[PDB]
Amino acid sequence: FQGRFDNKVVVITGAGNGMGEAAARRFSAEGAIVVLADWAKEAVDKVAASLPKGRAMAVHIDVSDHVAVEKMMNEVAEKLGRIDVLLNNAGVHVAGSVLETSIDDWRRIAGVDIDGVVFCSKFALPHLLKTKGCIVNTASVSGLGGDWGAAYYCAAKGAVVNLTRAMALDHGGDGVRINSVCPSLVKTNMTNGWPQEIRDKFNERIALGRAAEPEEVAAVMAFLASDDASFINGANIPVDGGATASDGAPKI
Amino acid sequence: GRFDNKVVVITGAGNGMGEAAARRFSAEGAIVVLADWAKEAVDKVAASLPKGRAMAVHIDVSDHVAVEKMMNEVAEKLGRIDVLLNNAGVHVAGSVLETSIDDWRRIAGVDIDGVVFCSKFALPHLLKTKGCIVNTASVSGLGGDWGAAYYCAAKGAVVNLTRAMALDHGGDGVRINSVCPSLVKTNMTNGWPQEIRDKFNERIALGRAAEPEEVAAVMAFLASDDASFINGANIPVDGGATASDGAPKIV
Amino acid sequence: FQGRFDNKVVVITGAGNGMGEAAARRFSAEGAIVVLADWAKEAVDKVAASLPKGRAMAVHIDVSDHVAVEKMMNEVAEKLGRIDVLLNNAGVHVAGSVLETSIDDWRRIAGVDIDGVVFCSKFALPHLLKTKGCIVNTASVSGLGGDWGAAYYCAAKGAVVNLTRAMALDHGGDGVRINSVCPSLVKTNMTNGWPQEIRDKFNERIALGRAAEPEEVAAVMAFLASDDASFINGANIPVDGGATASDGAPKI
Amino acid sequence: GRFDNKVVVITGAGNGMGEAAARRFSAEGAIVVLADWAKEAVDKVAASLPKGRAMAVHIDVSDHVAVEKMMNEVAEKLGRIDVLLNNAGVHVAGSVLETSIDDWRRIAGVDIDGVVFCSKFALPHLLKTKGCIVNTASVSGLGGDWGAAYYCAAKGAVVNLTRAMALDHGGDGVRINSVCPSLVKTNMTNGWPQEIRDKFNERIALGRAAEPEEVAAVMAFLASDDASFINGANIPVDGGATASDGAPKIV
Ligand SMILES: NC(=O)c1ccc[n+]([C@@H]2O[C@H](COP(=O)([O-])OP(=O)(O)OC[C@H]3O[C@@H](n4cnc5c(N)ncnc54)[C@H](O)[C@@H]3O)[C@@H](O)[C@H]2O)c1
Ligand SMILES: NC(=O)c1ccc[n+]([C@@H]2O[C@H](COP(=O)([O-])OP(=O)(O)OC[C@H]3O[C@@H](n4cnc5c(N)ncnc54)[C@H](O)[C@@H]3O)[C@@H](O)[C@H]2O)c1
Ligand SMILES: NC(=O)c1ccc[n+]([C@@H]2O[C@H](COP(=O)([O-])OP(=O)(O)OC[C@H]3O[C@@H](n4cnc5c(N)ncnc54)[C@H](O)[C@@H]3O)[C@@H](O)[C@H]2O)c1
Ligand SMILES: NC(=O)c1ccc[n+]([C@@H]2O[C@H](COP(=O)([O-])OP(=O)(O)OC[C@H]3O[C@@H](n4cnc5c(N)ncnc54)[C@H](O)[C@@H]3O)[C@@H](O)[C@H]2O)c1
Ligand SMILES: Nc1ncnc2c1ncn2[C@@H]1O[C@H](COP(=O)(O)OP(=O)(O)O)[C@@H](O)[C@H]1O
Ligand SMILES: Nc1ncnc2c1ncn2[C@@H]1O[C@H](COP(=O)(O)OP(=O)(O)O)[C@@H](O)[C@H]1O
Ligand code: NA
Ligand code: NA
Ligand code: NA
Ligand code: NA
């Protein structure tokens, strides 16, 4: 894998979260120039400073802001001369049915989880078309099926999963492949803090019996951006240890 | 009499599948609330149905303030809501590169926000009647199209919102399902060229576009007691469109 | 619904099981001439004798036997002059992973659950084409997704679900619609005998919080055979109270 | 060295995607067992690979007695099995009305029974290595075709067997997944007329048939440590074929 992404420019939104950092490190190890784009400063600055000098840069972005996103994509292309890979990894979650969640909760979910993927993809694509680059969306198993108690989140991830399909049809023939990863439970500080009773309920539904490490999702992002994935287009790859392979029946 | 004295709220009721649903539910005894932003069109449909059993509301379903008011006024005036058909929708053709931010806001406002808001504000009333929701999604929410990116994102949202809300509310006696039509003979597609429409007859195994009555028929079924164990389903009404793996005919 | 299937000939395989009997009664109530086809005699004889005289007949069939199935379909067509509806409702289940289940278990699952649908559909179709009739397959949620501990059964029901699609493409344009119902847990003597701990685990996965009555599955079969389903072709309708609408995550 | 000294059993290894997998796994350090009923073809592939690191088995995978023997002999002789590629397959074109009971038995024997039997008899060995299975399914197992009914039933079985076995064995450290190609340039499709093949370039967004190496690449990925959290997945390698809702292009 040494040199798989040598001198490729990889723009990573939501670069300051577990999967974002793992993606930045994996692509960086394989020779990429990473742009770590996030709202928050501290996390992406710390990651960028850990990576080879001149091969990583941190930016502030609100992915829900189309004017800011267009500017970021054009400045990155101007400064680095190219964009090869977009990882749409920004995310917000809010828990609840539509009865437990507000219009504001909807706007927060929709702005980042839907509008961010639409805007970053639309404004990166002209650059990707020049390099025959690709997009990898961070969707979710929550976009392939429903959850109890995350209605707006499921709507937004459902939008990303089907937008991945539609855009793959629109652009794949012009040499830009568009795919998603659909993770389940990812080991984070939030999941490390869960009681055993909660964590055991999740592990029972996943045949592999554990949460994904963020490196395990990053690995699939790197594969989907690689020449080995040359015939994978419009795919929403479950990275879920078997979660969505079930018909919903309990394990007996 | 399948829907005798059931209150049925139908968005996009002034034309096409909404109008066809209004007539079908009305014929089966429903009191029908016809919601549309096309005022002349929805007034004409309302006036065509039996007196005292149909009322028109001039509303943009993208507007949460207008939607909350409609749902509460309907519930107050008629005493109940039994069925919501989230049918109002608009289409725009093109990739994200050929369609504007404004095109996105129009698609998202009607096709996603409308469904979210109407569902949210009807649900407290549906819980009292053990009522149901039927969303008009599309095959374009079960898979992608060439040249309708924003529309596909919006319909994808409707398909998975259908699933999530069914898990949330099915246990409290409110079933939530969708219909997913392919080509239907309506104002939405009557501008589409013969080249495109003829290819649908190749991609749809039944070899024709659907009549709007044929989707209305499935909406009525999904709201009926015969659908008592169907929940969170996105029912293709597509003559076989989504049954295909995408391959052209092998022979 | 009085007269919806007036004088239509409805051939029901596996007519002696819960869903079969419920289908026979529902179609019979709506005016159909029912042929109740099953291996076993007592159950279908009792149902046929309960239904209007001259409007129900019981037959013995092994649906896994192509020679016997061709003969049954041609004799029914000759005797009644027509076939309008085929309900492929025969089934066997065997529990276990491929490590816990034998070659014989595979042959038993495959013969009835796959070969029966292939053979009955192939030999009924010439008759269905004359009436512009339809097929409704009894598939399962176990054909739309996997189970723990029913590997062969899941393979066979997966075959029925995709054969439903393929045959719908082949025949829908010649006026024979082909669809399936995909039930979850159906209330039977087997499920009535389950301990509360087992039944509670099933009910938790189903948003409606209960097993389907066989009448509730029969209702969907009758709909799929009706003129109201004129544009439904190649569909595998979940009749599962929400079971397959889940992404597999536990309810919290 | 990704597969250094891993034993990889490949059915249908004498041609097409099987042969391409044998060469790819061999280049990455695997010892490759090439199983095929085409004896000259699989012997030529085996003889092309590094001495001591490839062996041919002349076997009909539809035969459970032959398959159990192969799996146990391979395990005894090489001490282990790390990867099974259930790739052997045959195609027949036609509806059930145009294809015979014998056509069915041939399709089912190879395309279903072969996968069931090879999986069943390799699994005890894979459990010892925390190995994996990659099934060659098809888009024709994720949806239907016009004119390949028996093939679609068989591939549908492979797709859902992949899911069920992943739930059964994933917890014991054996991942089970499939690749689902659309049109690939192999002996299976080289007889298909230009009319049909040209329409695939329309239905596949990438606008071409796959090279067999492009599916072999995904087989190697699914057997690799990078796929450590992918289990029960049916991965489309189809240039977009199944991403479509079936509709022809909208513009
Ligand atoms: N016609 C097709 O081929 C097809 C296929 C799949 C799904 N659909 C869906 O069917 C639904 C109905 O559309 P149709 O085909 O019957 O078209 P139509 O144009 O006949 O009817 C749509 C109706 O919705 C109304 N409407 C639009 N936006 C609205 C808003 N913001 N507030 C209130 N009313 C609004 C329109 O005025 C119109 O009366 C839509 O959701 C559409 O996406 C259409
Ligand atoms: N902000 C809003 O309130 C808003 C926004 C958009 C449109 N609308 C309403 O939508 C309605 C339609 O106006 P429009 O500007 O969209 O026109 P339009 O673009 O819909 O033109 C007429 C449409 O209906 C079809 N049509 C034409 N003659 C018809 C007939 N006799 N019967 C049925 N269908 C016919 C046409 O093919 C076309 O689809 C108006 O009532 C308008 O006020 C509301
Ligand atoms: N080529 C395509 O377009 C395509 C698309 C989707 C999936 N597939 C699947 O790919 C797999 C490989 O086929 P291919 O396209 O590389 O074709 P191929 O003809 O190049 O190779 C298939 C190989 O399987 C062998 N084989 C067949 N039946 C066998 C049996 N009973 N026992 C042992 N070996 C047997 C053949 O001799 C041949 O060497 C099959 O499962 C096929 O269904 C093919
Ligand atoms: N019962 C069995 O053991 C059984 C059953 C069927 C076939 N087979 C074996 O399958 C093999 C193929 O024989 P067949 O009768 O299927 O022939 P065939 O029908 O496969 O004819 C040759 C096939 O390979 C292709 N081909 C032709 N020349 C080629 C070349 N130089 N390189 C690569 N591919 C080429 C052709 O396009 C065609 O697909 C034989 O070894 C046969 O014994 C085994
Ligand atoms: N509007 C936004 N613009 C850019 N990045 C954002 C925006 N909203 C959230 N992000 C970033 O996306 C990443 C993923 O968010 P989230 O999933 O909430 O984080 P976590 O995985 O830490 O819970 C975070 O690093 C977050 O700061
Ligand atoms: N080979 C066969 N030919 C015809 N009918 C069969 C065959 N095998 C089983 N059946 C019938 O199919 C029906 C469904 O079988 P099964 O699901 O095992 O029954 P149950 O629902 O009572 O458990 C039964 O009435 C059974 O007798
Ligand atoms: Na995960
Ligand atoms: Na129009
Ligand atoms: Na059920
Ligand atoms: Na050939």
Numbering used by the authors:
A (entry chain B), C (entry chain B): -1 to 250
B (entry chain A), D (entry chain A): 1 to 251
Text from the published report:
In order to determine the importance of the Gln247 side chain for the catalysis, we developed two mutants of SmBdh: (1) Q247A where this side chain is removed, leaving alanine at position 247 and (2) the double mutant Q247A + V139Q, where the missing glutamine side chain would be reinstated at the position 139 that is present in KpBdh. The SmBdh Q247A and the Q247A + V139Q mutants crystallized in the same space group (P43212) as the WT SmBdh repeating its protein chains arrangement. As with the WT SmBdh, the primary difference between the two molecules in the asymmetric unit in the mutant structures was that molecule A was found in ‘closed’ conformation (that could be best described by ~ 10 Å distance between Cα-atoms of residues Ala93 and Trp192) and molecule B was found in ‘open’ conformation (the corresponding distance is ~ 15 Å). Upon examination of the electron density maps, we were able to locate NAD + cofactor molecule and a substrate in protein molecule A (‘closed’ conformation), whereas in molecule B (‘open’ conformation) the corresponding space is occupied by only adenine diphosphate (as in Q247A mutant) or remains unoccupied (as in Q247A + V139Q mutant) at all. In the Q247A mutant structure, a glycerol molecule was modeled at the substrate-binding pocket. Acetoin was present in the crystallization conditions, but our attempts to use additional acetoin for cryoprotection only led to crystal damage. Therefore, a 50/50 v/v mix of glycerol and ethylene glycol was used for cryoprotection. We postulate that the absence of the Gln247symm side chain led to an increase of the available space for the substrate and therefore the larger glycerol molecule could be bound. In comparison to the WT SmBdh, Q247A mutant showed a ~ 90% loss in activity as predicted by the structure, whereas the double mutant Q247A + V139Q showed ~ 300% improvement in activity in comparison to Q247A mutant. Although the double mutant did not completely restore the loss of Gln247 activity, significant function was regained by introducing the V139Q mutation in this protein. It can thus be inferred that Gln247 is extremely important for the activity of the protein, which cannot be fully restored by a complementary mutation, such as V139Q.
